[PDB]
Coordinates of C-alpha atoms in Angstrom, one line a residue:
X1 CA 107.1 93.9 95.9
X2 CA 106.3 90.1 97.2
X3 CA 104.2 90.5 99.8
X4 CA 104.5 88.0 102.7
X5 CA 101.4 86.6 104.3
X6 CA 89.5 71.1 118.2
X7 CA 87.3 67.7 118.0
X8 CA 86.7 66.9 114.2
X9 CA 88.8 63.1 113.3
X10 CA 73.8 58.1 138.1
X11 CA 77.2 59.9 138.6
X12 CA 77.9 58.6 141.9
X13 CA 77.2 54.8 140.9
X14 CA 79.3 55.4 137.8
X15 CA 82.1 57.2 140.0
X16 CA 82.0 53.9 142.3
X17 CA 82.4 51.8 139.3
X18 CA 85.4 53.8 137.8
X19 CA 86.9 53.3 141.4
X20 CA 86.4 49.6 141.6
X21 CA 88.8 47.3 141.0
X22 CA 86.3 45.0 139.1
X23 CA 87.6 45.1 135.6
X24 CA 83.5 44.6 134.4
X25 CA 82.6 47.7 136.9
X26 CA 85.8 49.8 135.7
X27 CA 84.8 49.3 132.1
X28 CA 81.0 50.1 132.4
X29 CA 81.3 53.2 134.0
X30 CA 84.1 54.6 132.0
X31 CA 82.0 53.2 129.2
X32 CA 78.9 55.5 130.6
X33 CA 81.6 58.3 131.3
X34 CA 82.5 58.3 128.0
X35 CA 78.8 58.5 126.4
X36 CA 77.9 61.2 128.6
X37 CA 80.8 63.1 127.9
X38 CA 80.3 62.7 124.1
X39 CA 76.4 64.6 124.1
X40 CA 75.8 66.8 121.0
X41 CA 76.1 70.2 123.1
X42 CA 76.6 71.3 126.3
X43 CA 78.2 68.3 127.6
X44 CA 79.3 68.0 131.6
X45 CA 82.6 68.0 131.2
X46 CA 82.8 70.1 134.5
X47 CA 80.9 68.6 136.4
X48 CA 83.2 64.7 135.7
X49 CA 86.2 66.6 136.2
X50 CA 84.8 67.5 140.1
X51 CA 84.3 63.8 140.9
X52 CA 88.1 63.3 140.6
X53 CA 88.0 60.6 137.8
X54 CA 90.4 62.3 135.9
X55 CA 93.9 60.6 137.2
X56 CA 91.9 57.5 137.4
X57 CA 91.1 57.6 134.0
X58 CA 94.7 58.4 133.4
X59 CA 95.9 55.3 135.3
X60 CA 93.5 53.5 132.9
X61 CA 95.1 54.2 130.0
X62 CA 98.4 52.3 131.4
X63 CA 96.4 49.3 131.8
X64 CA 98.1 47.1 128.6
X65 CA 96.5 44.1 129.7
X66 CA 92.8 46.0 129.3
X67 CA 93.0 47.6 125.9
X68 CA 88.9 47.9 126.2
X69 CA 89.6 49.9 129.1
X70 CA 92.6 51.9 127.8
X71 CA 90.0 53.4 124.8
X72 CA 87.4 54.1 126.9
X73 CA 89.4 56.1 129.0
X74 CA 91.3 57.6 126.1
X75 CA 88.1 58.6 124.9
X76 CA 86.5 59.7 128.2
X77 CA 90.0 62.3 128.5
X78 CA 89.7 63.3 125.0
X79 CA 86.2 64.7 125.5
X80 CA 87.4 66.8 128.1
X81 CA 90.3 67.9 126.5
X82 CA 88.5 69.3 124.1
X83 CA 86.2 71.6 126.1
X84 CA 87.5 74.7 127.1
X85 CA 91.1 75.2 127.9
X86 CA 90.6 75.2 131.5
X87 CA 89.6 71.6 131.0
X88 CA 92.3 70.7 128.7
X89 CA 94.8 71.6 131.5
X90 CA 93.6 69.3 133.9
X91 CA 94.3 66.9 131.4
X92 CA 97.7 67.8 131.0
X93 CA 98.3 68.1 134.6
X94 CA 97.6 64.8 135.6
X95 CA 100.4 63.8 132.8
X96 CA 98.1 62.3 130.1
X97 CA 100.9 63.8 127.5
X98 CA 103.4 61.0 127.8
X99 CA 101.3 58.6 128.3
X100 CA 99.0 59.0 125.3
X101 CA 102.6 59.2 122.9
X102 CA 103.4 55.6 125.0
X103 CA 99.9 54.9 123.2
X104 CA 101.3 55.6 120.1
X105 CA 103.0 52.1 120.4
X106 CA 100.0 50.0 121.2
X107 CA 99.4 46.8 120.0
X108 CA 95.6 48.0 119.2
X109 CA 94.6 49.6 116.3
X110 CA 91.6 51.4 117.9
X111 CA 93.6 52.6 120.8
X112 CA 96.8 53.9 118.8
X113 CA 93.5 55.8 117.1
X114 CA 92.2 56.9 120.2
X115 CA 95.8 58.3 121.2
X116 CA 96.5 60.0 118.0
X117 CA 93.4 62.1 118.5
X118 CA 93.7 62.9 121.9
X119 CA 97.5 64.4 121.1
X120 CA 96.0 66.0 118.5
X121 CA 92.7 67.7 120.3
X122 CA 95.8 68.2 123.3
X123 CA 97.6 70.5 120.5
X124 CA 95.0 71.9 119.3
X125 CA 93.9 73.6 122.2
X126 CA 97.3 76.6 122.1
X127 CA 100.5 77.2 120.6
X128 CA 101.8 76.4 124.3
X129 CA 99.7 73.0 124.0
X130 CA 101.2 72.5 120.3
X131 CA 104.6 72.8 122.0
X132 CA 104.2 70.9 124.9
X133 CA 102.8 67.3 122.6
X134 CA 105.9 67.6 120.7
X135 CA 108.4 68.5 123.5
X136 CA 107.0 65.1 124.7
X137 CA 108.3 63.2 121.5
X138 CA 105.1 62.9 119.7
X139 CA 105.8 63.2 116.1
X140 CA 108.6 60.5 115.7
X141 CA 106.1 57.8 117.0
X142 CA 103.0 59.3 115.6
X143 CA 105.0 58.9 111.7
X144 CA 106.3 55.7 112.6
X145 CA 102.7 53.9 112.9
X146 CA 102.1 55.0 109.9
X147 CA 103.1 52.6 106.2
X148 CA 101.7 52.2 103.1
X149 CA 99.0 49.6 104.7
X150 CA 97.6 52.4 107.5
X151 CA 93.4 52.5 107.0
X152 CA 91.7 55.5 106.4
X153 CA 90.4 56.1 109.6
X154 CA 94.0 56.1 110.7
X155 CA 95.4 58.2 107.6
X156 CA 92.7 61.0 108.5
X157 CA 93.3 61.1 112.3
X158 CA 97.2 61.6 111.8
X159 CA 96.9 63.5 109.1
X160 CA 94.5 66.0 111.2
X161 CA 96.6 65.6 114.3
X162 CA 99.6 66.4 112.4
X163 CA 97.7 69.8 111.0
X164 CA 97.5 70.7 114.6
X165 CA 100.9 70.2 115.2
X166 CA 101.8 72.6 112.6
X167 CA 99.1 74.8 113.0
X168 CA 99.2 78.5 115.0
X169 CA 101.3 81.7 116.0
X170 CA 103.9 81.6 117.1
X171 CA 104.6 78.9 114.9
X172 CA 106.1 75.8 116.1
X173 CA 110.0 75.4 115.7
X174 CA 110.7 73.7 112.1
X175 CA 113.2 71.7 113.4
X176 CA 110.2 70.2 115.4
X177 CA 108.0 69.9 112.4
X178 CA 110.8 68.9 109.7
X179 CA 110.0 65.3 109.8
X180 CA 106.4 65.2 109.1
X181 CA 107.2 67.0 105.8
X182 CA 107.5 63.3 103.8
X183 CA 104.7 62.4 105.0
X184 CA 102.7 65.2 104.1
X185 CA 104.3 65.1 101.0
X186 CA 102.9 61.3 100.5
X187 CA 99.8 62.3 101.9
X188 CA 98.5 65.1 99.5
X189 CA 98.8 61.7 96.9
X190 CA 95.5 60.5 98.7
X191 CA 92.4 60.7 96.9
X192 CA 90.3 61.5 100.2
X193 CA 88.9 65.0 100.6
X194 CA 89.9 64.9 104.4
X195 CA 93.4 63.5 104.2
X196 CA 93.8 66.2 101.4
X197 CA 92.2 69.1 103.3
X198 CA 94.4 68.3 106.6
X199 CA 97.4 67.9 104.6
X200 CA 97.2 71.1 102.8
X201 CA 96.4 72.9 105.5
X202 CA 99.8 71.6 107.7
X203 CA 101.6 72.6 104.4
X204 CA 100.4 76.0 104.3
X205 CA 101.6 76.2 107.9
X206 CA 104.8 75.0 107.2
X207 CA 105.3 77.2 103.9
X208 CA 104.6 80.3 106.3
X209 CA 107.4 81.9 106.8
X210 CA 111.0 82.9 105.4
X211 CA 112.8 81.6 102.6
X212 CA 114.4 78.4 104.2
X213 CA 111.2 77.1 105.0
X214 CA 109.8 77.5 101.8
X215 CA 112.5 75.8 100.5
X216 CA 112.1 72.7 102.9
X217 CA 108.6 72.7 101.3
X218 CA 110.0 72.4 97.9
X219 CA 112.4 69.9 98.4
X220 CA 109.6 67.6 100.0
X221 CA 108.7 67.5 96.4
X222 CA 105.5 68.6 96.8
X223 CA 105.0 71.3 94.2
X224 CA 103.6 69.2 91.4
X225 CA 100.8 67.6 93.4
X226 CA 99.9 71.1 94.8
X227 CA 99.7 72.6 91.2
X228 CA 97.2 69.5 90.7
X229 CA 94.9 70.4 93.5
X230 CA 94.3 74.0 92.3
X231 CA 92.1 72.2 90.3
X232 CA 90.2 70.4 93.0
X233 CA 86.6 70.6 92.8
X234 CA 86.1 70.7 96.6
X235 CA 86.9 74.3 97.9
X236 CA 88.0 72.7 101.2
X237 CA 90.7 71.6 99.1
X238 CA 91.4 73.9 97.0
X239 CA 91.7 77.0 99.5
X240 CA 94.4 75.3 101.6
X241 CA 96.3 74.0 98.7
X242 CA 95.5 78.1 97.2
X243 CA 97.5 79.1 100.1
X244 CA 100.1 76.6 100.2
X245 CA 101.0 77.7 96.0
X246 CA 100.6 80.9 97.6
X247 CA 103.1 80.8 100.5
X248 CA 106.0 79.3 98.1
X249 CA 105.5 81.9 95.5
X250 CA 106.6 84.7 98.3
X251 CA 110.1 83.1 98.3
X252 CA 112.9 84.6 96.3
X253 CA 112.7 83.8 92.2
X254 CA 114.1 80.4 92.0
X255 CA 111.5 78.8 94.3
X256 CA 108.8 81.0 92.8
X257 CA 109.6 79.2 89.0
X258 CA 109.4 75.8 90.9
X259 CA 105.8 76.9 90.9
X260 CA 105.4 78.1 87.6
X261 CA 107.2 74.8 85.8
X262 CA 104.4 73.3 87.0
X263 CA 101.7 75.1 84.4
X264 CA 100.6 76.9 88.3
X265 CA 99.9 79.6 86.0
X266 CA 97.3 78.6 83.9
X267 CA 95.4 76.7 87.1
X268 CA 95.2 80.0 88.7
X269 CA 93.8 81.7 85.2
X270 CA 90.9 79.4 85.5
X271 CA 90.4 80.3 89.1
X272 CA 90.1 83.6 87.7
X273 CA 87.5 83.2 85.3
X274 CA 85.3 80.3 87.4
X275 CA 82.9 81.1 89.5
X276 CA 84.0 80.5 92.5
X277 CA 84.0 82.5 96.0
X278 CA 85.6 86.0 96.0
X279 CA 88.0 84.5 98.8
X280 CA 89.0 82.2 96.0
X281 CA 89.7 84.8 93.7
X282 CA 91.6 87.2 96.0
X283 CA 94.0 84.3 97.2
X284 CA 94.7 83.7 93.0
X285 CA 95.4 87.5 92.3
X286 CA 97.5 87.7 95.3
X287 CA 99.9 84.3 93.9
X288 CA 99.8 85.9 90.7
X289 CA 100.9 89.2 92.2
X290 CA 103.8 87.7 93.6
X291 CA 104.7 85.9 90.8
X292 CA 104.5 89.6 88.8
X293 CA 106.9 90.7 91.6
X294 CA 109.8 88.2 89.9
X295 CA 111.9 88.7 86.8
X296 CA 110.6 89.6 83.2
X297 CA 110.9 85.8 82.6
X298 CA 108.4 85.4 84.9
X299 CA 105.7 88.3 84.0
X300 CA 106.1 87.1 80.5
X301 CA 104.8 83.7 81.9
X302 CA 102.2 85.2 84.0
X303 CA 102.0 87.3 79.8
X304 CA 102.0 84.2 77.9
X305 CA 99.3 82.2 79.9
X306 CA 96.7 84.7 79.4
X307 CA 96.2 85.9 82.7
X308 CA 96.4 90.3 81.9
X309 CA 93.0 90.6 80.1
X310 CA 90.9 88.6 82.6
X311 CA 93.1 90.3 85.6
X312 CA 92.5 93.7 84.0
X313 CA 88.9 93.2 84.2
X314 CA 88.7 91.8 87.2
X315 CA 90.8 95.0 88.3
X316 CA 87.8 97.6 86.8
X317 CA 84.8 95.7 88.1
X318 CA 85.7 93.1 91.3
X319 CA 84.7 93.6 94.6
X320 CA 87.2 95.9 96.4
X321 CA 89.2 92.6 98.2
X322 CA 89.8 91.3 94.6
X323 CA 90.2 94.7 92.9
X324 CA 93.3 95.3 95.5
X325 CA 95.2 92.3 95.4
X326 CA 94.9 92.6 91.0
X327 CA 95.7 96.3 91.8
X328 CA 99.4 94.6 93.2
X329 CA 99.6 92.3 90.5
X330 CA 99.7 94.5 87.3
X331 CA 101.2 97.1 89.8
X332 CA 104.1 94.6 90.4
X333 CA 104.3 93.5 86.8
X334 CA 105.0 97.5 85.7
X335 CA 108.0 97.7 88.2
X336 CA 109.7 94.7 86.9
X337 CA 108.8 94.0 83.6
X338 CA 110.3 95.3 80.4
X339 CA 109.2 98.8 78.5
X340 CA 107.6 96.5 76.0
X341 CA 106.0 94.5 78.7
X342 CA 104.4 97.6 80.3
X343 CA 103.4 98.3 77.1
X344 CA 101.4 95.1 76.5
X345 CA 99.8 95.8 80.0
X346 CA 98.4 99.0 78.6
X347 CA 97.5 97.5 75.4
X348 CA 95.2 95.6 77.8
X349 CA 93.5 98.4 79.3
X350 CA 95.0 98.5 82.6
X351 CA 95.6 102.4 82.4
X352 CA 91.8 103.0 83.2
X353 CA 91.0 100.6 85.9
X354 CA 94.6 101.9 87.9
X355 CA 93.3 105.0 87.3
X356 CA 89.9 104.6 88.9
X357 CA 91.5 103.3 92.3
X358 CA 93.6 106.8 92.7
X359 CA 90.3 108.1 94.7
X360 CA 90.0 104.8 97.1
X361 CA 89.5 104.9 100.5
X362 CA 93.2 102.6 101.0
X363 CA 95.9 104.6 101.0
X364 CA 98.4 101.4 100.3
X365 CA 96.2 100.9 97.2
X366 CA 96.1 104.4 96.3
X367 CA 100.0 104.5 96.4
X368 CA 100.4 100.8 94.4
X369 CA 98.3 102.5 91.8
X370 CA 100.1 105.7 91.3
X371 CA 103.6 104.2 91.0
X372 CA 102.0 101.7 88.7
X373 CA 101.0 104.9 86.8
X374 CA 104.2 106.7 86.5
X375 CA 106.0 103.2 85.4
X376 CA 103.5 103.4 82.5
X377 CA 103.8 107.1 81.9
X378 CA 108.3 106.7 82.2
X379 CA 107.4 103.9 79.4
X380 CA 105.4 106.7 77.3
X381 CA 108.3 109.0 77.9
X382 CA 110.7 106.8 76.3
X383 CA 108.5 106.2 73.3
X384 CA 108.3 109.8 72.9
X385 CA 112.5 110.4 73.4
X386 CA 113.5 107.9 71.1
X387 CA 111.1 108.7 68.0
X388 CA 111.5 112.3 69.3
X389 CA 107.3 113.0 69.4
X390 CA 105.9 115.8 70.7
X391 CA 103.6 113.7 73.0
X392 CA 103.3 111.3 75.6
X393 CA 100.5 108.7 74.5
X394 CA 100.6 107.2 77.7
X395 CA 100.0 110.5 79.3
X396 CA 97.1 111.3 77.2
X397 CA 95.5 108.0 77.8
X398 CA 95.6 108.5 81.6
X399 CA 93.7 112.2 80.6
X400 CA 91.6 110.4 79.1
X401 CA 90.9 107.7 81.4
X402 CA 90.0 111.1 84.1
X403 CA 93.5 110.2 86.0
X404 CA 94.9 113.6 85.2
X405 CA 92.6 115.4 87.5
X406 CA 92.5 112.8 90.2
X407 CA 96.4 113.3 90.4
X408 CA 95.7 117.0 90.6
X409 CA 93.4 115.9 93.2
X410 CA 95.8 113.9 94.8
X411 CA 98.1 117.3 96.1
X412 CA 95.3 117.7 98.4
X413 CA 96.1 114.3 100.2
X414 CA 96.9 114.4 104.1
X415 CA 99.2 111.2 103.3
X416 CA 102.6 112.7 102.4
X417 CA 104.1 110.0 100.2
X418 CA 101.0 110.2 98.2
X419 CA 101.3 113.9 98.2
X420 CA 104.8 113.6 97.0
X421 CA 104.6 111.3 94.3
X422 CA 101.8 113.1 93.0
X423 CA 103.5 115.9 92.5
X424 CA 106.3 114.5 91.4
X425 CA 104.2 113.0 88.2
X426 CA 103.0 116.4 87.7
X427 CA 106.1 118.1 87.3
X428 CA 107.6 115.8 85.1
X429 CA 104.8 115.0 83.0
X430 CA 102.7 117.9 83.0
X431 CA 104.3 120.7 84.0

């Protein structure tokens, strides 16, 4: 049941300058390059690009001796780089890609900066782009620059360039990303909102996918500091590290408790019960639901840290995006957990609200809702068999609750796995 899922840090007598070989004249205009290519909106980048500055610019940033010259110029190509993608490959053509990772080993602070971003905006631009920076070896030296006395501004371009790098679909090869996983790890430590926002948001890249990634996550050691920033105040924290917790929790049991260890469960409880963006809300019922897709030890945490009642509710009165992803989570919890388990669920109310859904417009939600149904009504069964009753409480509750006749209801549904099950419940429960 688990459930898988750019920018921001007079032409002719400036074209003359930038071809001078007066170091004065050379700096000016790529000085006034730079300025006009920086405007608020709508800025020319393709009208520069005609006057063939580009390479020149390019050759600039070779210039060691001229590290003046070399940002400028950084920062002249940057800003077209990150105009359309069209612009961005003239960029690329004219080789800027190895030359801005050479920049990675300046002497200067400001242009190292300068280069960092421009690999960064480079990568951001396409998957192919992403590829391409760090085919060119951009990571290794883009880490190495960084230590325990880095500035801010540096710690917030890296950590942004290095969200790019990890950033899109298809995803970039983890063997090509591995490395910058201690350093993220160190960097979600940081008490700045930007460092912690780019940081989260490379890790929820990274914990996309299948099990062995997830597990390189974990082993970065990260789990703990995640847990923390559930609690962030900021949402632009919060959401990314949301989906991080989230990502992990989609692994196999064992990775899923590394979470949990960590009180996770409790965090996403108050998520539940703040008020706080729907978006917010869905991403908690979704961890949770994959956390009710685990062993009994697990549901009994999810149990134990208060989470049914307020899920419940949210389940009979949420906007539909919430409603379905709580609709998984006690679904989830009634496949795994224990007869007693399923039984606390209903103590909670969750027969109603699961009934309710059966006449929903989503046919996946209709279906999570009826087998979490006929776990609870199996469950009533037993209670029956083994104090040999004469009735099914669980059965009368969902009569109750109007769920008999929206099964009935439910052998008029096109869907045929609907249809089936329906039927199915019938004719052992009511036939």
């Amino acid at each position: 049941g688990r459930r898988r899922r750019k920018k921001r840090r007079s032409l002719p007598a400036m074209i003359g300058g930038v071809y001078s070989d007066d170091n004065n004249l050379q700096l000016e205009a790529t000085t006034q390059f730079r300025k006009l290519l920086s405007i608020e909106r709508s800025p020319p980048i393709e009208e520069v690009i005609q006057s063939g500055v580009v390479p020149r610019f390019v050759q600039f940033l070779t210039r060691e001796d001229f590290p003046q010259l070399q940002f400028e110029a950084a920062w002249a190509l940057t800003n077209i780089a990150s105009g359309t993608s069209e612009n961005t490959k003239v960029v690329i053509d004219h080789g800027a890609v190895p030359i801005f990772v050479k920049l990675l080993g300046s002497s200067s602070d400001d242009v190292r900066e300068q280069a960092v971003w421009a690999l960064g905006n480079v990568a951001g631009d396409s998957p192919k782009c992403r590829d391409l920076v760090l085919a060119n070896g951009a990571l290794l030296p883009l880490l190495a620059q960084l230590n325990e006395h880095t500035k801010l501004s540096m710690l917030r371009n890296a950590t942004w360039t290095l969200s790019n790098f990890c950033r899109g679909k298809p995803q970039p090869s983890f063997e090509q990303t591995r490395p910058a996983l201690p350093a993220l790890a160190r960097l979600i430590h940081s008490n700045d909102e930007e460092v912690l926002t780019d940081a989260c948001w490379a890790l929820s890249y990274l914990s996309d996918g299948t099990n062995d990634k997830i597990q390189a996550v974990i082993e970065a050691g990260v789990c703990p500091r995640l847990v923390e920033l559930l609690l962030h105040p900021s949402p632009s924290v919060l959401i990314p590290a949301l989906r991080t917790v989230g990502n992990i929790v989609t692994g196999d049991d064992a990775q899923t408790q590394c979470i949990i260890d960590h009180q996770a469960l409790p965090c996403l409880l108050s998520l539940l019960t703040q008020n706080l963006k729907k978006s917010i809300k869905k991403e908690a019922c979704w961890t949770i639901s994959n956390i009710t897709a685990g062993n009994k030890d697990q549901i009994q945490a999810v149990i134990n840290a208060g989470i049914i009642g307020p899920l419940v509710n949210l389940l009979q009165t949420a906007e539909f995006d919430i409603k379905k992803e709580a609709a998984w989570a006690i679904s989830n919890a009634t496949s795994g957990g224990s007869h007693d388990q399923i039984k606390y669920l209903v103590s909670e109310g969750c027969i109603k609200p699961l009934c309710d859904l059966l006449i929903c417009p989503d046919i996946r939600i209709v279906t999570v809702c009826l087998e979490g149904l006929e776990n609870i009504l199996k469950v009533g069964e037993t209670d029956k068999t083994l104090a040999a009753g004469d009735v099914n409480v669980f059965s009368q509750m969902i009569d109750e609750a109007e769920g008999l006749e929206k099964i009935e209801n439910l052998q008029s549904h096109d869907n045929n796995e609907i249809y089936e099950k329906a039927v199915k419940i019938l004719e052992a429960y009511w036939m």
